[PDB]
Amino acid sequence: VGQLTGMYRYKYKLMRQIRMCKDLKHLIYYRFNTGPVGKGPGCGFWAAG
């Protein structure tokens, strides 16, 4: 959301949510890109964030 929309420039606290979502990504990705999956833009587990 931060990259696509510059809303963090109008309320700083949003960084928390921003960082929160990114952290969630990392959590899901490392669990998603496991075994023969590889790395790429193939994850759509959006309900986490």
């Binding site: 931060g2 963090y8 960082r19 990114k22 959590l27 669990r31 496991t34 075994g35 023969p36």
Partner: protein
């Protein structure tokens, strides 16, 4: 290097910028001792697997210790169904592979 690290830890105890990526200085998993640096992952009787990680990747990655334990204890009279179910699995996911 564990000794010097643990002695140093004993001495420690007894004596604007919109950045989104976190810092590596908030990491806490750093450990000066092996028993917590390398924790024994729960094999969970071999029949339990971590949620996010894929199943068969864990199966082949598993320590196989319970595999050889079962190989030791299992008798011939009840190995036929084990082999049959294993081959039937290999066939039915081979269906997906092909």
């Amino acid at each position: 290097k564990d000794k010097s690290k643990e002695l140093h830890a004993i001495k420690e105890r007894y004596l604007r910028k919109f950045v989104f990526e976190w810092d590596a200085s908030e990491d806490t998993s750093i450990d000066y001792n092996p028993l917590y640096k390398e924790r024994h992952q729960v094999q969970l009787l071999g029949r339990g697997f971590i949620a996010g990680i894929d199943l068969k990747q864990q199966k082949r990655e598993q320590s196989r210790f319970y595999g050889d334990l079962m190989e030791k204890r299992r008798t011939l009279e009840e190995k036929e169904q084990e082999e049959a179910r294993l081959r039937k699995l290999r066939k039915k996911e081979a269906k997906q592979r092909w």
